[PDB]
Design an enzyme around this catalytic site. Structure first.
Site, PDB file in Angstrom:
ATOM      1  N   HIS A 185       4.297  -0.687  -0.785  1.00 25.97           N
ATOM      2  CA  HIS A 185       4.758  -1.986  -0.059  1.00 25.97           C
ATOM      3  C   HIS A 185       4.756  -1.920   1.462  1.00 25.97           C
ATOM      4  CE1 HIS A 185       8.582  -0.026   1.348  1.00 25.97           C
ATOM      5  NE2 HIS A 185       8.593   0.815   0.382  1.00 25.97           N
ATOM      6  N   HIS A 214       6.380   3.244  -3.649  1.00 25.45           N
ATOM      7  CA  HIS A 214       6.774   3.651  -2.419  1.00 25.45           C
ATOM      8  C   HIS A 214       6.033   4.917  -1.979  1.00 25.45           C
ATOM      9  CE1 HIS A 214      10.315   1.173  -3.168  1.00 25.45           C
ATOM     10  NE2 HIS A 214      10.300   1.302  -4.313  1.00 25.45           N
ATOM     11  N   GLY A 215       6.028   5.196  -0.779  1.00 22.53           N
ATOM     12  CA  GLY A 215       5.281   6.348  -0.175  1.00 22.53           C
ATOM     13  C   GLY A 215       5.518   7.386  -0.754  1.00 22.53           C
ATOM     14  N   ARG A 227      12.002  -4.033  -2.449  1.00 24.07           N
ATOM     15  CA  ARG A 227      10.716  -4.292  -1.421  1.00 24.07           C
ATOM     16  C   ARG A 227       9.427  -3.788  -2.462  1.00 24.07           C
ATOM     17  NH1 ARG A 227      13.885   0.371   0.067  1.00 24.07           N
ATOM     18  NH2 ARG A 227      12.762   2.398   0.297  1.00 24.07           N
ATOM     19  N   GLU A 271      11.833   5.078  -3.922  1.00 24.74           N
ATOM     20  CA  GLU A 271      11.465   5.769  -2.790  1.00 24.74           C
ATOM     21  C   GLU A 271      12.332   7.382  -2.800  1.00 24.74           C
ATOM     22  OE1 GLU A 271       9.795   7.424  -0.310  1.00 24.74           O
ATOM     23  OE2 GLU A 271       9.532   5.495   0.762  1.00 24.74           O
ATOM     24  N   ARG A 272      11.859   8.351  -2.067  1.00 22.62           N
ATOM     25  CA  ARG A 272      12.812   9.360  -1.875  1.00 22.62           C
ATOM     26  C   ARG A 272      14.216   9.160  -1.297  1.00 22.62           C
ATOM     27  NH1 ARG A 272      13.346  13.281   2.359  1.00 22.62           N
ATOM     28  NH2 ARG A 272      11.762  12.650   3.656  1.00 22.62           N
TER      29      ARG A 272
END
Ligand SMILES: [Cl-]
Lengths: 240, 235
Positions: free
Chosen positions: B10, B185-186, B61, B88-89
């Site tokens: 995202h 997410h990353g 998101r 996400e983390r």
């Protein structure tokens, strides 16, 4: 004690809701989109929480669902899509306005189809402008040749909607999961008819309002304890 | 190429704009983050991509990123599966803090570790933290066990709760020949890239996945990339 919420999508593009939209994948019009957003705002203001959502595979119902989940901040909920909650498949009539259907099939037959519970419309044939568009849509690739309709009477629609209700939705309700269903006029009739035990004529007279959360209160055996309730501002709720 | 897998990270969130650590906080996309997803979606559409199933997190998101892509490629009808394991983390005690003030107060060295070390997690989110109830008491996590719900995570933690979902839920789809789209997410995606390519702790930590861009893998029968990941769109 059990709470169940239904919502019928609003206006689709190009007046298709007055043109037997059926299985053609019409999007919501901006007005239809606005209607869903108000429906979702009514659910937000009333504090509704859900645990799982069911919808059809038609974008107008899906977008209606997305708009509601966004408005109530529950975009994280599990969502299950099924062709069994699709609008009635209107066969050869799909996409035609009133004048055009009368001009094509005559007043006699049109009147018969209008009032009939198990007389199907004419099948959508290969010359129909939506024939390949619908019949070859990848989203139906798992239906057997027998399951994929060329047309449906209201009774057919209800017959393929009910199994999903029974095998997929009921169990969730029994586990106390709060269910939201965003679907179509005819598929939601199937559920109402089962819930209340209405007659064939009764159900054909039921016109569920669009864009409006329809609330059911069900006992432990999933029988409603009272009439369906409409949520929304005074102006919207009034029109009913 | 026998298999095709698509990932998308995202874009910009509301808290990226506010310069705050998000982690599990459910920040929405900024308008620019929304626009990225749309361009990413248009790229997939121009390249005629078809999917059979979608995976995403329980964080809006990423969910909104997926929705926007589905809308763009006219595949809103696809089955979508959401899981916290793709979140996400979890940023722990840093959640909600201004990133600049955090560096000012703690120093560069310390913050670098919290943001990018592999196995050293940020400080824990304690019951007094302003977002403790907002995150830890959120009913979307109500089915996690005590041992499952984190109060903070290193990248290794993140990868460790992510790979099980990948192995149990995503791999079987792929082998069934389902074309998978993952919108996440990353850090959650870092784990997948790490597993697919078998990168080292060091290499994965210097992996910065671009946002709002379709990341395309071509896998063989063993789900090993037959070439380097590619990107979709313009420049
Ligand atoms: Cl969805």
């Amino acid at each position: 004690a059990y709470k169940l919420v239904l919502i019928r999508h609003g206006e689709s593009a190009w007046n298709l809701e007055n043109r037997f939209s059926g299985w053609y994948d019409a999007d919501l019009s901006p007005a239809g989109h606005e209607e869903a957003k108000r429906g979702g705002q009514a659910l937000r203001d009333a504090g509704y929480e859900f645990d799982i959502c069911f919808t059809s595979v038609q974008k107008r119902a899906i977008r209606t669902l997305w708009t509601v989940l966004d408005a109530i901040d529950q975009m994280w909920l599990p969502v299950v899509r099924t062709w069994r909650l699709n609008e009635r498949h209107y066969g050869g009539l799909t996409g035609l306005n009133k004048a055009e259907t009368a001009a094509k099939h005559g007043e006699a037959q049109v009147k018969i189809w209008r009032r009939s519970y198990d007389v199907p419309p004419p099948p959508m044939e290969p010359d129909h402008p939506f024939y390949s568009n619908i019949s070859k849509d990848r989203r139906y690739a798992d239906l057997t040749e027998d399951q994929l309709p060329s047309c449906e009477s209201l009774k057919d629609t209800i017959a393929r909607a009910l199994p999903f209700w029974n095998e997929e939705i009921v169990p969730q309700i029994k586990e106390g999961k709060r269910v939201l269903i965003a679907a179509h006029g005819n598929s939601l009739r199937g559920i109402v008819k089962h819930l209340e035990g209405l007659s064939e004529e009764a159900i054909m007279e039921l016109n569920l309002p669009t864009g409006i959360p329809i609330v059911y209160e069900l006992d432990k055996n999933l029988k409603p304890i009272k009439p369906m309730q409409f949520l929304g501002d005074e102006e919207t709720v009034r029109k009913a």
